[PDB]
Amino acid sequence: IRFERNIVCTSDLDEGIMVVYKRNIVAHTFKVRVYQKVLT
Amino acid sequence: SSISTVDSMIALDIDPLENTDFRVLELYSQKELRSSNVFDLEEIMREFN
Structure with missing residues (x-):
């Protein structure tokens, strides 16, 4: 039971x-x- | 006071939904609707009269 960085967060069609x-x-x-x- | 600070706030600024005044769209005017007929009843009755 060891904590770890397991939380990875990552972030006009046709005008005319x-x-x-x-x-x-x-x-x-x-x-x-x-x-x-x-x-x- | 130059030691600086920490901006720990996680921004969650959600813009409000802008208001929309829906138009009363009209495709064919009443003149075109009356002129979209081969036979017009008023003309026929006037000619008969």
């Missing part, structure tokens, strides 16, 4: 710039012409 894009949901809007005649 980020840009986040979402999935576009707006419906595509274009111009439509409708020709027609009215007979009354």
Whole structure:
């Protein structure tokens, strides 16, 4: 029974710039012409 | 008083957890949500009227 130094004590990931894009949901809007005649 | 001293204190300074005010993140605005439809009911009803 002899004491001894058996206690040995010993003691940022990826920084960066980020840009986040979402999935576009707006419906595509274009111009439509409708020709027609009215007979009354 | 130059004989010096002994700093036997084992430092255990644990920084407090900083406060965080969570944002109310909004991905799509209400305008995009209303514009994300092939058919709009208000337009159809207005044209019928």
